[PDB]
């Protein structure tokens, strides 16, 4: 009767819906079921009283703009993406409230038995009193700038992506604390049994002294100038962003260490004690000329049983991009508005590092080249876009990595102007392209394998060592003839040696039929013929749909297995292999009429 009046007052597509949550409800009241969920079904409305016994209360995703007045004995509340702007009175024996995705900004009196209260993902600007009982505390991604007095009886406390400058004092027993992503210039006393502290993305400058049986310590991105002691028990050490000058002693039982870009000069000696499966990342740090020997020294000696570690050379702003750009391009107006297109800065900042290389430093001839490809991608905007989104690193590091990626920038615009047209009728300059990617490929490959054979890496320069080495004697146009740091980057001279054979080798081998697989080579054909190319693809699609089909009729039928999800995968992993070999077929006579006379030596 209430529920009648309400069903029928809903707009024409709530109609059903609304049906279906009287029917729910009557199910409640008619067996005494006590748990009503109103299902998602774009509710914008509910009715004035729900059954009086219900006990648990769940609303999904639906529109809903106001709740009525809640069943009093109501012991959970479960509150999905809604409009709500305001909770009704919350029944005196609630146990759990849940809401999430909600423009709620605050909330009604929290009943004296509350135990959890999970209220992450609204918009709340302020907390009620929390009942002394509360054990879990979760109000992450909210617009608090603080928080009240915290109940004694709190074992977890989330509250990341908020506004908070400082914390209440913490309850005995709490166990969790995970407050990252706010604007905290400290923490107060850390309880004894906390085993993990998330803090990372605070303004911290230092740390409480850190319980016996912390397991977990996330504090990158603060100011910390330094760490206290170390517990024993700590797995999980990532600090990562900070000033610190040096380490404590490292725990043995450490399982990652994440260090990078803090001011380091020295390290610990207990971090070579460390498992041979812990992670450890030193990155970005003053490291000494001696504690690299010694490392390096320590992690070759046969017998090294410690972590794989990984560094650089790095060590431990951004003008207006036509400045940057000025000071390379030959005699920069068109770099005023490139100026504010999208990772403009970092690319801006790219160009300033670019000046501070071994190139620029030792090759006359650098300033024009990098004038050129300016020039170049003044003129297409798809292209510049890629290569400013490129430039996100390579700031990141030293002066080998911005080399790195200027080569893979180079790369992308060969690959861009082969895609683009730029070689339709240069096809030797086509074929070239595709050798040189082929090339840089088989390096690519040749220098991941050569980095999981070091226990002390720095797989950019790992990676740079192998193009920078071998651009003459494999032609890689798009690579520059300086670098920095090739003495640290682990790559011996049989290395070299052997790398130049295998692509040689492999090239010889495979080159033919991998430029059958290569997208410039399609997007020119597709342009040569496109007609022919056009039913080659449609056809590619065809054969995969009757070959699955047939599959299934011949081998899945038979047994099994015409539902079984796991042999339809495997089926079908056949059938576009199958339908792929015949597709590339077809695309070889092809080939092999507009490419044969550029194929030879």
Do not use: E, H, I
């Given at each position: 009767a209430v529920w009648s009046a309400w069903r029928r007052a809903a707009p024409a597509e709530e109609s059903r819906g609304r049906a279906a949550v009287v029917q729910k409800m009557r199910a409640c009241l008619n067996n005494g079921n006590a748990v009503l969920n109103v299902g998602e079904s774009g509710l914008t409305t509910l009715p004035d009283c729900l059954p009086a016994h219900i006990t648990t209360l769940v609303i999904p995703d639906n529109n809903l703009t106001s709740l009525p007045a809640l069943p009093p004995e109501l012991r959970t509340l479960e509150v999905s993406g809604?409009?709500?702007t305001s909770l009704p009175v919350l029944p005196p024996g609630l146990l759990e409230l849940s809401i999430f995705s909600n423009p709620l900004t605050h909330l009604p009196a929290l009943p004296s038995g509350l135990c959890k209260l999970w209220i992450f993902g609204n918009q709340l600007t302020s907390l009620p009193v929390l009942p002394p009982g509360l054990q879990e505390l979760s109000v992450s991604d909210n617009q608090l700038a603080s928080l009240p007095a915290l109940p004694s009886e709190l074992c977890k406390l989330w509250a990341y992506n908020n506004q908070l400058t400082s914390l209440p004092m913490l309850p005995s027993g709490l166990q969790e604390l995970s407050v990252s992503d706010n604007q905290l210039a400290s923490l107060p006393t850390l309880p004894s049994e906390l085993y993990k502290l998330w803090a990372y993305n605070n303004r911290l400058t230092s740390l409480p002294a850190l319980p016996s049986g912390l397991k977990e310590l996330i504090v990158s991105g603060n100011r910390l100038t330094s760490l206290p002691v170390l517990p024993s028990e700590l797995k999980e050490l990532m600090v990562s962003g900070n000033r610190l000058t040096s380490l404590p002693?490292?725990?043995?039982?450490?399982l990652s260490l994440s260090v990078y870009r803090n001011q380091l000069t020295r390290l610990p000696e207990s971090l070579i004690h460390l498992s041979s499966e812990t992670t450890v990342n030193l990155e970005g740090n003053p490291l000494s000329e001696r504690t690299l020997q010694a490392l390096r020294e320590i992690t070759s000696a046969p017998g090294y049983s410690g972590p794989i570690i990984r560094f650089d050379m790095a060590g431990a702003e951004t003008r207006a991009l036509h400045l940057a750009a000025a000071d390379w391009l030959?005699?920069?107006?068109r770099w005023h508005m490139f100026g504010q297109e999208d990772n403009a800065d970092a690319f801006s900042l790219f160009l300033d590092r670019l000046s501070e290389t071994e190139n620029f430093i030792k090759d006359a001839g650098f300033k024009a080249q990098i004038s050129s490809w300016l020039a170049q991608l003044a003129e297409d905007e798809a292209l510049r876009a890629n290569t400013f989104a490129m430039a996100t690193e390579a700031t990141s590091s030293c002066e080998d990595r911005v080399t790195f990626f200027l080569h893979q920038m180079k790369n992308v615009q060969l690959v861009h102007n082969a895609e683009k047209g730029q070689y339709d009728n240069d096809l030797a300059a086509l074929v070239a392209t595709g050798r040189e990617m082929f090339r840089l490929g088989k390096l690519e490959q040749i220098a991941r394998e050569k980095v999981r054979t070091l226990?002390?890496?720095d797989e950019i320069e790992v990676w740079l060592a192998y193009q920078n080495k071998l651009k003459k004697s494999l032609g890689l146009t798009s690579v520059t003839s300086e670098m920095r740091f090739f003495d640290v980057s682990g790559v011996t001279v049989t290395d070299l040696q052997d790398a130049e054979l295998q692509v040689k080798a492999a090239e010889k081998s495979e080159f033919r039929e991998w430029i059958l697989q290569w997208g410039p080579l399609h997007r020119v054909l597709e342009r040569k013929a496109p007609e022919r190319v056009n039913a080659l693809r449609e056809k590619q699609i065809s054969d995969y749909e009757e070959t699955y089909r047939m599959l299934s009729d011949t081998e899945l039928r038979p047994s099994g297995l015409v539902g079984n999800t796991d042999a339809e995968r495997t089926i079908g992993a056949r059938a576009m292999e199958s339908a792929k070999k015949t597709f590339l077929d077809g695309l070889r006579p092809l080939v092999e009429e507009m490419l044969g006379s550029y194929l030879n030596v």
């Open positions: 809604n409009q709500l002693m490292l725990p043995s039982g450490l030959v005699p920069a107006d226990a002390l890496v």
